[PDB]
Design an enzyme around this catalytic site. Structure first.
Site, PDB file in Angstrom:
ATOM      1  N   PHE A   1      66.454  56.188  -5.249  1.00 23.67           N
ATOM      2  CA  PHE A   1      67.668  55.639  -4.722  1.00 23.67           C
ATOM      3  C   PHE A   1      67.888  54.585  -4.313  1.00 23.67           C
ATOM      4  CE2 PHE A   1      69.904  57.743  -1.281  1.00 23.67           C
ATOM      5  CZ  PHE A   1      69.349  58.731  -1.478  1.00 23.67           C
ATOM      6  N   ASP A   2      67.429  54.239  -2.570  1.00 18.85           N
ATOM      7  CA  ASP A   2      67.808  52.701  -1.616  1.00 18.85           C
ATOM      8  C   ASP A   2      66.141  53.183  -1.024  1.00 18.85           C
ATOM      9  OD1 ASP A   2      69.208  51.466  -1.218  1.00 18.85           O
ATOM     10  OD2 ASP A   2      69.838  52.839   0.469  1.00 18.85           O
TER      11      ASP A   2
ATOM     12  N   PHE B   1      63.961  60.892   2.993  1.00 17.70           N
ATOM     13  CA  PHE B   1      64.198  59.650   3.597  1.00 17.70           C
ATOM     14  C   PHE B   1      63.008  59.442   4.358  1.00 17.70           C
ATOM     15  CE2 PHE B   1      68.521  61.220   3.076  1.00 17.70           C
ATOM     16  CZ  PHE B   1      69.484  59.365   2.410  1.00 17.70           C
TER      17      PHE B   1
ATOM     18  N   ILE C   1      75.026  60.243   7.155  1.00 17.70           N
ATOM     19  CA  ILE C   1      74.973  61.153   6.564  1.00 17.70           C
ATOM     20  C   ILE C   1      74.742  62.206   8.019  1.00 17.70           C
ATOM     21  CG2 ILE C   1      75.321  61.232   4.391  1.00 17.70           C
ATOM     22  CD1 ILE C   1      72.541  61.410   4.006  1.00 17.70           C
TER      23      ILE C   1
ATOM     24  N   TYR D   1      75.655  64.523   1.337  1.00 18.61           N
ATOM     25  CA  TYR D   1      76.513  64.133   0.316  1.00 18.61           C
ATOM     26  C   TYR D   1      77.501  65.251   0.167  1.00 18.61           C
ATOM     27  CZ  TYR D   1      75.295  59.205   0.880  1.00 18.61           C
ATOM     28  OH  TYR D   1      75.069  57.929   1.284  1.00 18.61           O
TER      29      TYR D   1
ATOM     30  N   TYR E   1      64.266  52.111   6.358  1.00 19.86           N
ATOM     31  CA  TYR E   1      63.777  53.472   5.355  1.00 19.86           C
ATOM     32  C   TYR E   1      64.145  53.732   3.994  1.00 19.86           C
ATOM     33  CZ  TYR E   1      69.352  52.861   4.113  1.00 19.86           C
ATOM     34  OH  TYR E   1      70.166  52.415   3.181  1.00 19.86           O
TER      35      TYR E   1
END
Lengths: 780, 384, 357, 107
Positions: D36-37, D99, D56, D82, D26
């Site tokens: 961010f990731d 995502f 999450i 979050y 992902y």
């Protein structure tokens, strides 16, 4: 824009290099919670890319190399580096196989071999930002094997092209080409990542001839030289670790022989002493001396002036002689690491006037360790311990807890750090190794680490951590007699900073019941306690001032405490410590304010009168204090403690019948200090007994806030020790005025309902400890 | 009021006196026993005197009429001015020797220490007030020590700097309100050129030792610099500068200052307000004590970071404070960090701000995790 | 204990392997001697084909650590090891024979003091700021090593350094050290008497000085001062008395006398303690001998200060309360001579007494 | 709360039942378009057991509608993400995440 466009955009270079310094700062010194966050701003792929990037400007190459270490490796590196000075070697067969020189007398390669010293594995956690939402977070995982192989490959590329000295200074200079890679390789060597083949590769890149172009096959700057020193110090540490491990393995293999022949010798001596006696009568001293004096006797065959005194057969002595020669040869007493370093350091020093102080320090530390090898082994053997193979698990967990404790010494205290200290310290105290192996614990120096953290917190905020540290240390001291002596050397500190458990009870734990430790107090350290007592008998706690209490003229809360340490330093094991007995008396009378409001002399109040006043203050709510602390009992505790302590200093019977001048003088001084009438009067107080009935329900007085009869016990002791019971008449007086109405108070309390009321228990303990023994002694 | 004080005060400037004989010619002659001489405090210029109301005092220079301020060192308390000798004289008194009793000349009174030690000294340490007595104690004899030329020069620089900057402050307070309108300035002229020159000279007085200075020379000059900064601070020169900054800070710009002081006066507003911020850093750079002074007026510094008249100077002051004092790092809150970060947004990409933020995390090898977390939480997640 | 002493063959293996390590370290590793200081200093001293040689970069580095403005001088095991190495280097009846030994020792000290060792020693004594410890002991032993025999070159170098730097730290630290020097005690003696009276045995343990504890350091310090004025130097004998040029002066000679008065007080205190006890037991012999060695060194230091006819030091001593000390000493001397003469087992102590006289 | 948008179809037949580990590669981005990731940078597929609430919420109703091999885009609102607290230093408060999820293998 490309980041390599920062080769000519210098303002952005400065800003970005300092951005990376900011990243390294915000994740520095253990903050793994922020390292995880920074793995979302600089990911693994960017880091692994910047490691191999040839065109990055130097300030950014070095920055991105330092950032990888800071995010991923630095915490594990320091935790490992703290365990690299203690050698716990388990007695496993793996250990037993260790030998100094590889079989078939040449040195093996440093860092290449089998090592059994316990170093806890270092833990990592994967970085994911999709996990749902506090135990301390671990460092972000980076694949260590791929990183290690890349590090070796980059180092290899930089060297065989270091010799060419083309105008390819990757990063812009030789310093920026080499220093960043050497730092990474040093870190991964220290952590433990490198295998044996990889270590061989590093060693060949250092010096191909000695270990079989090298990094010493071309001239270097003084920044690269420092990292070369940091590598050679690693390989010099591994040789020392090898020496210690091989010496432990030899101990394992040789104590077996020293035990087997001792047992066979004992069998032979048991056949002897039968029809062949008085010729072996002395030779049973070995078996009846302390076991170390047996292992210290047995190893006495070096100087050849004590040959036959050693019972060991000659074959057994031979093993130790041979290993000793091997140990000497290993220590040096180029073709060797010692010769290589000794040559290369001198050559650097005599090739140029080295300007970097750090380089000079590292250079000469290395040179020292090479010349004095046998003196380095001797300074590490204090920190070598051999545990059985079963205790490995507990020791591993204990080492992890210790690492946590000594990793929070570079961190200013906070809530979470408090919690980690408390968890770790409570975990050590629950480990059987902490009890079974006191010498390991004093060898690892936990007590010193705990005192360091207690110093930092005291030097109060965070009372929980102080309470935990002072419990741990008071337990340390009760484990074994050497632990007290180790902590006794800190008495000056603990007395400087002196719930219930506080850095004073640690001080009173060092000296308790060790008359050898009592007779090592320095009079000034007994003095400072009296100074605190004086400061406690003239003003009152600002704490209770903030609690809105009566605040009469003096707090007894600190006075009672400081009369408790002084009670454990005057009377040990049931006898009076004369030397410490007299000193406290002198220091008390030289400062007569320490005796409280009563006994002040001028404007004085009878000790009896003062106790009566505290009786009347016990009930009235206005003068007791508007919960955990009350006063009606406080003044009573202070005076009871003072009377007990003054009774302790009274000389025992030896000196009194010996007519020793000092003894009689001290007793007369105490006799003057407190009259008699008050003594037998406080014996004669009325003691509010658990009142029966009262509509049928038990209503006992709170002897956490009333005249506990234990108060009187102190004044019972004094009478026995100082005044005494010499005439029968005085005895039949004290029996009626104070004693008997108490014993049948207890006897009335002996009923079923009031058998277990806490007043009854206190009174029973009181009678059995103070009154009845005195009656037993005065029975004739 | 005089005192006999102990401790570090005997390496300070409040303890320095200057013996001023009663003759202008040959005033540097060898002191002789029992010759009249005034004694002047150096850092305040006040002459020791016997006034009727309070006995021993330090009276100003306008009231030293040779009856109150004259004195005579004497050897013994027995009952004994000499004819002036036109020379260096016969040397009598020595240094670190020659026990001498100080006797006022007209009142005969000997200098002694007031015996009373009250409740303030029941637990406190003795600071014996010095009083003039008819007969006095028998142990009141005094050694005279000498002060290094550095200390004497500094103690006299403090006497002029304090006077100059108090004139400046009291001039600023003359037109604190009182708008000029379209007329003249309020009162007497500000000493602006003198202030600029004095600040320029004091900034060079405190300049750090150079790098090419060879090691031992460097470490001697550092000790001297630390000493001089401590003297100035302990005589309250890090408060006089703060008061000048505050008075000159109630004005947003030079035109705002001109509306009260005048056009010519406002011509030097920015220059003065920058020199003050430079001198403050010069005073506090490297001293952990002078940097420790900012544990309570840190909001003083952080709240001036946005001021455009002198924005680099205030940042430099902050950098020195943060890089030298570790106790200041413990009082940083989110208010302060959200303000240092706002400098990046409002004043540009300046690496010195990042240097400040780096110093907010680790001080002397110990990490302050609250600051790390606050910088991470505020600066980073915006990605802007 | 004799009934339940455990033979080693019953112990677990690890608790025997840990006893073996201590015995091996005490008996075998430690007693082993290896002379490497000579070889190491001779390798550090040579240079390759001006710039300082490797040894002169060591002296300079430790000079650097001493001149660094720190409030208190730190523990450096590196300095303390190298100082011992250099001290060992310089440590090593015919006229020729004696003169060759002297010249050889002069050369060994020339290896050091031609590379800045004397200035390092002064700097570190100054930097310790009058704190007793191991750094000062190593520095003093190094100073003694390079000053043995009264090396005029080393003394001249030290004096020139002190005079040009005009630092008051050196004599303000020597004075502090001599004030902290311990003197003979009874109290600690009484306590350790009783502490041995407790016994020797422990449960799986064996019992392990607090009287005249720093005798070695005190002897070394006064040996250092004596070596500073050996050879009858007038400049040193006067500098120790007054430090001209420096802002304040510290009179070391009267400080030595003041220490000696403490010393005679304590020495008279043992004689009084023992005047009843017919025989001085062994502990008294040891402690009294230690005090006597220290007193011998202090007396020798005072001689060197005034041996050359330094008039200033002579009347400085004459006015000093050196007379109380000697008047007191003579009492101990006469009475202990009487009491010690009455036994043959105390002949050694009487010999030491006569030498001290 | 979560909005699934198919980018490339998978099988449309096998869906992750409870208790089957899901391997998904992902990449994630704040709705403004910042990253961010990614797991692809770390180079390893991310595995999670559906039903154990490790991930999450929106990531857990979201990777449940996907099929094996499918590549889709989820838009988790802070309610199912979050939320008001955030992931300090990574994700600002009151944030919506996007995502790019590729469900590679089931178990």
């Amino acid at each position: 824009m490309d980041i390599l466009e920062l080769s000519e955009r210098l303002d952005l270079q400065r800003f970005h290099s300092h951005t990376l310094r900011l990243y390294r700062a915000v994740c520095a010194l253990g903050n793994n919670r922020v390292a995880h966050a920074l793995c979302s701003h600089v990911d693994q792929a960017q880091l692994l890319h910047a490691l191999e990037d040839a065109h990055l400007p130097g300030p950014l190459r070095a920055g991105y190399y330092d950032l990888l270490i800071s995010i991923h490796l630095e915490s594990a590196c320091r935790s490992r580096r703290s365990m690299l000075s203690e050698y716990i070697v388990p007695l496993t067969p793996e250990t037993r196989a260790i030998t100094l020189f590889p079989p078939g007398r040449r040195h093996g390669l440093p860092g290449v071999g089998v090592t059994t010293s316990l170093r806890p594995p270092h833990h990592f956690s994967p970085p994911c930002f999709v996990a749902a939402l506090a135990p301390a977070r671990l460092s972000p995982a980076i694949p260590l094997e791929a990183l290690r192989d890349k590090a070796l490959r980059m180092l290899g590329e930089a060297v065989r092209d270091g010799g060419q000295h083309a105008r390819d200074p990757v990063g812009g200079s030789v310093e920026f080409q080499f220093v960043p890679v050497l730092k990474l390789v040093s870190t991964l060597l220290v952590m433990g990542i490198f295998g044996d083949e990889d270590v061989k590769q590093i060693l060949k890149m250092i010096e191909p001839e000695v270990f079989t172009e090298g990094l010493l096959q071309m001239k270097l700057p003084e920044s690269v030289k420092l990292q070369m020193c940091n590598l050679l110090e690693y390989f010099c540490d591994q040789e020392l670790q090898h020496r210690v491990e091989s010496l432990a393995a030899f101990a394992e293999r040789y104590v077996d022989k020293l035990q087997a022949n001792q047992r066979s010798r004992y069998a032979l001596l048991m056949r002897a002493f039968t029809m062949s006696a008085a010729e072996t009568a002395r030779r049973t001293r070995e078996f009846r001396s302390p076991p170390q004096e047996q292992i210290n006797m047995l190893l006495h065959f070096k100087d050849e002036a004590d040959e036959e005194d050693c019972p060991l057969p000659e074959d057994i002595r031979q093993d130790l002689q041979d290993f000793h020669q091997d140990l000497l040869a290993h220590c040096g007493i180029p073709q060797s690491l010692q010769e290589l370093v000794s040559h290369m350091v001198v050559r650097w020093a005599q090739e140029d006037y080295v300007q970097s102080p750090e380089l000079v320090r590292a250079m000469f530390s290395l040179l020292h360790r090479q010349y004095d090898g046998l003196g380095e082994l001797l300074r590490a053997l204090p920190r070598a311990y051999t545990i059985s193979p079963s205790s490995v698990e507990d020791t591993m967990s204990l080492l992890e807890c210790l690492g946590q404790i000594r990793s929070l010494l570079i961190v200013q205290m906070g809530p979470q750090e408090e919690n980690l200290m408390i968890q770790s310290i409570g975990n050590i105290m629950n480990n059987k190794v902490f009890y079974q192996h006191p010498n390991l614990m004093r060898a690892l120096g936990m007590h010193e680490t705990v005192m360091e953290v207690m110093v930092n917190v005291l030097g109060i905020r965070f009372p929980k951590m102080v309470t935990s540290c002072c419990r741990f240390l008071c337990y340390f001291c009760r484990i074994s007699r050497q632990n007290q002596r180790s902590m006794f050397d800190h008495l000056s500190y603990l007395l400087e900073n002196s719930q219930g458990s506080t850095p004073l009870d640690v001080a009173a734990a060092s000296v308790i019941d060790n008359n050898e430790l009592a007779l090592a107090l320095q009079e000034q350290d007994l003095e400072k306690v009296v100074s605190y007592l004086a400061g406690c008998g003239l003003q009152s706690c600002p704490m209770l001032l903030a609690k809105g209490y009566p605040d009469i003229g003096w707090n007894p809360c600190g006075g009672e405490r400081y009369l408790d340490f002084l009670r454990f330093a005057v009377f040990v094991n049931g006898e009076s410590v004369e030397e410490n007995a007299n000193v406290v008396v002198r220091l008390l009378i030289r400062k007569p304010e320490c005796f409280g409001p009563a006994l002040r002399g001028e404007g004085g109040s009878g000790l009896l009168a003062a106790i009566e006043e505290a009786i009347r203050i016990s009930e009235d709510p206005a003068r007791d204090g508007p919960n955990r602390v009350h006063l009606g009992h406080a003044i009573m505790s202070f005076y009871a403690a003072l009377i007990d302590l003054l009774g302790r200093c009274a000389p025992e019977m030896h000196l009194i019948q010996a007519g020793k001048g000092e003894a009689l003088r001290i007793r007369a001084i105490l006799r003057s200090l407190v009259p008699l009438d008050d003594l037998v009067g406080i014996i004669s107080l009325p003691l509010q007994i658990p009142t029966l009935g009262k509509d049928g329900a038990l209503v006992q007085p709170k002897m956490s806030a009333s005249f506990v009869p234990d108060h009187k016990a102190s004044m019972v002791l004094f009478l026995d020790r100082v005044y005494g019971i010499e005439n029968q008449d005085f005895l039949l007086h004290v029996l009626d005025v104070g004693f008997l109405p108490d014993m049948r108070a207890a006897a009335s309390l002996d009923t079923a309902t009031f058998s277990t009321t806490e007043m009854a228990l206190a009174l029973n303990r009181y009678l059995c400890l103070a009154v009845l023994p005195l009656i037993t002694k005065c029975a004739p | 009021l005089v005192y006999y004080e102990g401790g570090a005060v005997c390496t300070h400037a409040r303890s320095l006196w200057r013996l001023e004989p009663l003759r202008i010619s040959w005033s540097g002659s060898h002191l002789r026993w029992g010759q009249p001489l005034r004694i002047r405090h150096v850092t305040t210029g006040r002459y020791l005197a016997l006034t009727e109301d309070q006995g021993l005092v330090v009276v100003d220079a306008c009231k030293a009429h040779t009856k109150a301020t004259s004195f005579c060192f004497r050897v013994s308390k027995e009952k004994l001015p000499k004819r002036d000798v036109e020379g260096m004289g016969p040397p009598e008194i020595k240094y670190g020797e020659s026990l001498c009793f100080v006797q006022h000349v007209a009142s005969g009174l000997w200098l002694t220490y007031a015996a009373p030690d009250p409740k303030a000294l029941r637990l406190g340490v003795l600071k014996k007030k010095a009083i003039l007595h008819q007969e006095g104690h028998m142990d009141d004899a005094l050694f005279l020590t000498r002060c290094q030329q550095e200390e004497s020069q500094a103690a006299r620089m403090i006497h002029s700097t304090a006077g100059l900057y108090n004139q400046f402050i009291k001039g600023l307070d003359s037109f604190s309100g009182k708008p000029r309108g379209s007329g003249p300035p309020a009162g007497p002229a500000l000493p602006i050129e003198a202030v600029i020159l004095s600040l320029q000279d004091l900034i060079g007085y405190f300049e750090p030792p150079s790098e090419e200075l060879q090691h031992e020379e460097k470490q001697s000059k550092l000790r001297s610099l630390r000493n001089r900064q401590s003297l100035f601070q302990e005589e309250g020169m890090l408060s006089l500068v703060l008061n000048c900054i505050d008075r000159l800070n109630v004005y947003t710009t030079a035109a705002h200052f001109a509306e009260y002081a005048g056009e010519e006066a406002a011509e030097s507003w920015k220059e003065i307000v920058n020199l003050l911020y430079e001198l403050l850093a010069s005073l506090i750079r490297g001293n952990r004590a002078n940097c420790a002074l900012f544990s309570t007026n840190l909001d003083w510094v952080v709240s001036k970071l946005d001021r455009l008249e002198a924005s680099s100077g205030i940042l430099e002051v902050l950098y020195c404070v943060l890089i030298e004092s570790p106790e200041v790092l413990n009082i940083i809150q989110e208010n302060h960090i959200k303000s240092i970060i706002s400098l990046l947004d409002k004043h540009g990409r300046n690496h010195k701000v990042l240097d400040v933020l780096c110093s907010l995390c680790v001080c002397n090898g110990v990490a302050v995790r609250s600051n790390q977390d606050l910088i991470t939480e505020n600066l980073l997640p915006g990605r802007e | 204990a004799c009934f339940r002493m455990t033979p080693l063959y019953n112990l677990p293996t690890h608790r025997a392997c840990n006893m073996f390590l201590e015995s091996y370290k005490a008996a075998w590793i430690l007693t082993e001697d290896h002379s490497f200081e000579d070889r190491m200093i001779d390798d550090l001293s040579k240079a390759g084909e001006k710039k300082p040689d490797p040894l002169h970069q060591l002296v300079l580095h430790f000079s650097r650590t001493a001149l660094t403005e720190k409030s208190k001088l730190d523990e450096d095991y590196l300095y303390m090891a190298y100082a011992d190495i250099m001290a060992k280097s310089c440590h090593l009846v015919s006229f020729e024979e004696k003169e060759m030994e002297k010249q050889r020792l002069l050369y060994q000290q020339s290896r050091l003091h031609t590379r800045g060792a004397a200035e390092m020693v002064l700097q570190m004594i100054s930097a310790c700021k009058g704190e007793t410890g191991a750094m000062v002991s190593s520095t003093l032993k190094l100073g003694i090593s390079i000053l043995n025999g009264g090396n005029a070159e080393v003394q001249q170098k030290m004096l020139d350094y002190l005079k040009d730097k005009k630092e008051v730290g050196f004599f303000q630290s020597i004075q502090a050290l001599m004030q902290t020097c311990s003197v003979l005690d009874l109290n600690a003696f009484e306590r350790q008497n009783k502490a041995e009276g407790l016994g020797m045995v422990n449960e799986d343990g064996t019992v392990i000085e607090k009287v005249m504890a720093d005798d070695e350091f005190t002897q070394d310090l006064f040996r250092f001062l004596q070596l500073l004025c050996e050879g009858h130097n007038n400049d040193f004998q006067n500098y120790l008395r007054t430090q001209t040029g420096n802002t304040t002066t510290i009179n070391i000679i009267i400080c030595t006398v003041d220490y000696l008065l403490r010393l005679q007080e304590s020495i008279s205190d043992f004689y009084w303690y023992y005047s009843g006890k017919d025989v001085i037991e062994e502990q008294g012999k040891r402690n009294f001998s230690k005090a006597m060695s220290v007193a011998k060194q202090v007396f020798n230091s005072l001689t060197e200060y005034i041996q050359g006819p330094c008039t200033g030091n002579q009347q400085s001593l004459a006015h000093s309360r050196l007379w109380d000390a000697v008047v007191g000493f003579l009492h101990v001397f006469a009475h202990m001579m009487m009491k010690l003469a009455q036994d043959s087992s105390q002949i050694e102590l009487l010999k030491e007494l006569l030498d001290l006289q | 709360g979560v909005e699934i948008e198919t980018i490339s179809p998978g099988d449309g037949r096998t869906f992750p039942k409870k208790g089957q580990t899901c391997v998904v590669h992902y990449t994630g981005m704040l709705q403004n378009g910042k990253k961010f990731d990614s797991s692809r940078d770390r180079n390893k597929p991310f595995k999670f057991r559906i039903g154990k609430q490790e991930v999450i919420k929106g990531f857990e109703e979201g990777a449940a509608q996907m099929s094996l091999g499918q590549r889709a885009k989820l838009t988790c609102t802070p309610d199912v993400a979050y939320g008001a607290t955030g992931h300090p230093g990574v994700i600002p408060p009151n944030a919506t995440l996007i995502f790019d999820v590729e469900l590679l293998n089931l178990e």
